[PDB]
């Protein structure tokens, strides 16, 4: 097949799950039991780019939906957003740079660094039910570590 993908869910190091807040926004919160069902399921694609043993470029989109995690400048600052794309042309092996994320395997966790903006990571707040955002600080007050779970697809 052209581009390879696998389905998964993501949780931050504080065990918070992701749910689609608005139409183009994600929020992180502690979920368990029935609520679990609300969590977003992703289709992670292995696209083209600078690769390494612990740095794999990927694209992140919602499963079965033409929505992808993108990186753009807003108020002179790298920002995260969910972007709509033509459902016929995606996903592809050569994704536009703003859609590429470097999946980094640290200790036993994962970090998602923007390919566009070096050292900017998909982060979550310690707080409950807050938006997921792009952060440029490491080891600070915000969470930048994740674990992924593979789903039967």
Swiss-Prot record:
One Gene Ontology term of the molecular function aspect: protein domain specific binding
Induction: By LPS. Transcription and translation induced by M.tuberculosis and a number of different M.tuberculosis components in macrophages; EsxA is the most potent activator tested (at protein level). In pancreatic islets, release is increased by high glucose treatment. In pancreatic islets and macrophages, release is also increased by endocannabinoid anandamide/AEA.
Subcellular localization: Cytoplasm, Cytosol; Secreted; Lysosome; Secreted, Extracellular exosome
Regulation: (Microbial infection) Cleavage by S.pyogenes cysteine protease SpeB promotes its activation independently of CASP1. SpeB-mediated maturation of IL1B plays a dual role depending on infection site: while IL1B inflammatory response prevents bacterial growth during invasive skin infections, it promotes streptococcal infection of the nasopharynx by disrupting colonization resistance mediated by the microbiota.
Cellular component annotations (GO), alphabetically ordered: cytosol; extracellular region; extracellular space; lysosome; secretory granule
Effect of residue 25 to N: Requires 2 nucleotide substitutions
Marked site: Important for interaction with integrin: 55, 63, 65, 74, 88
Motif Involved in interaction with TMED10 C-terminus boundaries: 112-125
Site annotation Involved in receptor binding: residues: 4
GO biological process terms on file: apoptotic process; astrocyte activation; cell-cell signaling; cellular response to interleukin-17; cellular response to lipopolysaccharide; cellular response to mechanical stimulus; cellular response to xenobiotic stimulus; cytokine-mediated signaling pathway
Result, substituting residue 55 to E: Suppression of integrin binding. Markedly reduced activity
Chief location of this protein within or outside the cell: cytoplasm
Post-translational modification note: Activation of the IL1B precursor involves a CASP1-catalyzed proteolytic cleavage. Processing and secretion are temporarily associated. (Microbial infection) Cleavage by S.pyogenes cysteine protease SpeB promotes its activation independently of CASP1.
UniProt KW keywords: Cytokine, Cytoplasm, Inflammatory response, Lysosome, Mitogen, Pyrogen, Secreted
Expression sites (tissue/organ): Expressed in activated monocytes/macrophages (at protein level).
Assembly: Monomer. In its precursor form, weakly interacts with full-length MEFV; the mature cytokine does not interact at all. Interacts with integrins ITGAV:ITGBV and ITGA5:ITGB1; integrin-binding is required for IL1B signaling. Interacts with cargo receptor TMED10; the interaction is direct and is required for the secretion of IL1B mature form. Interacts with HSP90AB1; the interaction facilitates cargo translocation into the ERGIC. Interacts with HSP90B1; the interaction facilitates cargo translocation into the ERGIC.
Function: Potent pro-inflammatory cytokine. Initially discovered as the major endogenous pyrogen, induces prostaglandin synthesis, neutrophil influx and activation, T-cell activation and cytokine production, B-cell activation and antibody production, and fibroblast proliferation and collagen production. Promotes Th17 differentiation of T-cells. Synergizes with IL12/interleukin-12 to induce IFNG synthesis from T-helper 1 (Th1) cells. Plays a role in angiogenesis by inducing VEGF production synergistically with TNF and IL6.
Leftover remarks: The IL1B production occurs in 2 steps, each being controlled by different stimuli. First, inflammatory signals, such as LPS, stimulate the synthesis and promote the accumulation of cytosolic stores of pro-IL1B (priming). Then additional signals are required for inflammasome assembly, leading to CASP1 activation, pro-IL1B processing and eventually secretion of the active cytokine. IL1B processing and secretion are temporarily associated.
Family that this chain belongs to: Belongs to the IL-1 family.
Name of the protein in question: Interleukin-1 beta
Source species: Homo sapiens (Human)
Gene of this entry: IL1B
Section of the entire sequence shown: 117 to 269 of 269
